[PDB]
Amino acid sequence: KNIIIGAMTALITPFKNGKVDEQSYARLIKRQIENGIDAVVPVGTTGESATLTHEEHRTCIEIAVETCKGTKVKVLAGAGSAATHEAVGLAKFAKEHGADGILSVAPYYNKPTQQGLYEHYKAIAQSVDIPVLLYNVPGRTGCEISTDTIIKLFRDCENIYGVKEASGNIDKCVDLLAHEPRMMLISGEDAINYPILSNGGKGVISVTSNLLPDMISALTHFALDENYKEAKKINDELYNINKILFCESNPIPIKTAMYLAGLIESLEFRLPLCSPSKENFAKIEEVMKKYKIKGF
Amino acid sequence: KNIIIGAMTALITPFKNGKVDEQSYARLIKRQIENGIDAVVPVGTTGESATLTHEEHRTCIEIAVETCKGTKVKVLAGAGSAATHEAVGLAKFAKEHGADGILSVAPYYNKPTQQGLYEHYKAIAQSVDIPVLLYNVPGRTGCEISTDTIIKLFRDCENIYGVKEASGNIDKCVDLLAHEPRMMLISGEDAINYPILSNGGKGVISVTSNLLPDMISALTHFALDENYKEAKKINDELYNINKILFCESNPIPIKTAMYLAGLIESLEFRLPLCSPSKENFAKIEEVMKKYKIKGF
Amino acid sequence: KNIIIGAMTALITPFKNGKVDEQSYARLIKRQIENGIDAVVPVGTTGESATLTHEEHRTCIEIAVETCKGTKVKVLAGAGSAATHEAVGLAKFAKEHGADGILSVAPYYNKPTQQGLYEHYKAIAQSVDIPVLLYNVPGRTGCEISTDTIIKLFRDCENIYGVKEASGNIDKCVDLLAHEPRMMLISGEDAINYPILSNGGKGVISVTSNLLPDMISALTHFALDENYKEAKKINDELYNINKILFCESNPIPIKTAMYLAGLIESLEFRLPLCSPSKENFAKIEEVMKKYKIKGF
């Protein structure tokens, strides 16, 4: 199977006067490339995919593809939907725009059955010839891709190569790699990056790496080399910021931190997302002061 | 406040060869009108709103408005989204097409804060001059509209008149009506229709009423008339079917039941929804036989 | 079946210098009798059953029996355990000391299966000839007596006449009385006393009635008389105090309130229970000032 693994970043989407700040978007991706990141994920959850137009989806994916040309860095495009016909369309568009693979979140809100999830992802996988990574985040979608369903999709669909897990469930992480060790388990939960990697996970899709890409990169590559002492040390050091970045729903804290570090020009969200409370604004700033933040 | 209350039906959306069966849709609404229902909800969760196109949303709302014209049955159109700009557009769209009010689900997947939910619904309410009913269903959305946020929205926004609760939380139902008894609490969970109504709830938005509109409307009208003995009698009699209609994610069982009862021509869903398991298909068919199902 | 229903109080156990204050206990029970209560529950959860000795269990039950002599007020003795042999012994114990019935909590900590729960309660019921009320509180015990198991026990064992539910699950309350309308469903959660009674529940076992016995007895008796309007009025008025009495684990707040009202001499718990935080102490004091607390 063709795979996309390593240290990866769920890119925030900067706004300027209500529109995508395309120059800032490119600059942020270049900063990720220059700090050891192996792949970037445009228009995922952290990129506020739910409130972007389809034209803005295309714009962000195109900027990512253009910015990564001539480098080893891959573009793993967000391309999921609650509707199978739309997810298929978004997958084909991402492939057409030059993405290296797609990240496809489990359908949110309508709670498909496992049989429905299987048919959903089978249709997506058959629509493109680039790698497809599943994305399980039950706290946001209201459903769970079961271990058996993930494994069947991995075994039955050539291009589906693993899953990004954001489920706080290390038992499931053991279950997955014990019964199908060929899959690429990817951490979607920064605080437990090291435990997932040390059980044989092969990468992360990180929120924290927006702010600290070098530290997440080093953690991941230490772990992939089985230098678990050094990987755990970084995971432990990062725990405080990893947690404070979820004091309100992601991406409210990470966008706040990027603004606080001068990495984006405006603290703009698209409704229903909005600025954090004053108290959390201050708490994020205080945690940030403990970390070494790379510039441009 | 202008309100829309009483016995209401979250209409299924029948498909024929992958398209909305417009004649069946009108025929089903006529059947609701003839069995005492007070309002119909096109393109809600039960109507597979997530997989319909915007043109299909318009078609369903237009059929609902036309079929109810001259009958005093109101149209409470589903018009929610994870994106405030889209939810506002859908609200204005529903008003333009003649809806009497809108049902607007809490944003799914992106988990707005309470502050964001307030700004979200404030924007929606300000965009139209028809009643707006909030819809809280945390098991599907991943977020909860708190009692404080619901009450602030009710008091601050002229058009917001209540909430459809699908949360299995009778404590919260007491909390809501004890602190703001002027709001219209609407049951969004059929099995507990009577407990919500007997605490001062003023209506239901029902799944079961697709199949048994006469029984759900009588239950609601018994309760609103303070005949709690007879309202509870129907709620108790309905418990078995009320539960089996969620043995898989709604609307998979109710569409199965409508097909089994001869009320729709084909058991078609849009992916990622699909037919139930063979065992659940059998369980639904067995529970249905204990009830008298009105024809056309 | 012989039954014990109506307005009932889960009695606090006052301590003086670490010992059960027998004079205060009798005085508090008399205050319940004089304010319309139908039965009292010595040495339940609210009575700190977990930290009392077997001899202190005896003392409290005997005082309850003695104080109720010459009145209609029943003694429904706490007599449950995680060990079946101990629960049997405590049941016979309670009957020997003159109790009118027993309240028997589901085994905590060891998580028996439904078959084990059936055998547990069958053994208890066969050990005495007085009524036995089941008590389901999964947040405390770690297990749930299912509806099916409750109904089988009710139908198979002469003495088992119902269940006290503290489970935040009005759906289950419908389930229970829809399938077995002959049982006595008793509210174990004060905030939802009225919804449980209006669905056909026949009593409450209350924490709040320790402080406000007249209001809880009036609420229950209105509901039993089918004056649902007047019962709901009291339930709504009591919501604030009903909630603040669980701002920390019961009985920490109710003992605090009894101390603040001058009804017990000292704010004494047995470890691991202890005084509330200063912040919660103040919140309890403020909520109390909206209510008329009967003296002796």
Place this chain on the structure above:
Amino acid sequence: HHHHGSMDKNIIIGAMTALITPFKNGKVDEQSYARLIKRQIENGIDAVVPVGTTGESATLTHEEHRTCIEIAVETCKGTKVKVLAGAGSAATHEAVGLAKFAKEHGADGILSVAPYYNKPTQQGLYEHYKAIAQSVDIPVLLYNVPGRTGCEISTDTIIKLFRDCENIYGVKEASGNIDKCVDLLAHEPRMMLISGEDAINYPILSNGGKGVISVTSNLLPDMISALTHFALDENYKEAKKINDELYNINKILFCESNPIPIKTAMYLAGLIESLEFRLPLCSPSKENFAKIEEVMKKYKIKGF
């Protein structure tokens, strides 16, 4: 004072077994109990836990609690194997009494479960464990299992207890919460985190946990011991390989509430004479009995 964290703490770590308690005609089978502990000793186990959850502590009498601790202490004499006695209670006065008892009968330390059923606050848990720790001079391992107790010892409370009390040296976690496991050792790396959930033994050890208190080791003591000692030597390949191989049995041993499956498995393997529980525990369903039997076929089960 608040500065015990780097002062000398006696610890009990390594591969440890939560011993089942065999019954014969309703009584503790004392000969079987001794024989089972011998089998653990001979298969590389570092400590045994008498009368914990797996030992049906809830249904044993105080006298049976006594007898089981005494047999464990006597059987482990003359070996390296430690006795970490179950000694917890929902009542602080009883937990103190059980702690002193375990010390006076020769236990090496105590495992003290968070109070069940009465749901103490964090302040109450702190005072609870401070009282227990001050009553003895032997090591105390906290035990957090919220699915059974209805309460949680928070990370801050565990760390405060470690720093404020001389003899509290760590926590057995059975909480399905690897985030909390990171939280604990990132903020207080000096404590001994012990796995209380067999399926995730390797993830807990690879994050710096220093032992397991195992259900599976009743049946497969050599495998759990090997897993633990590989991990302690930082042979993470070998440790993970065993953890993966054990997943099927690790999960099926909880298809019904522990210890119903493990006693069923011990009976099926001929290691105990009768499948007897004390009510309210009882035999598994016939379907789960068969599932346990089938999962066992994958594994090499040591005899006596």
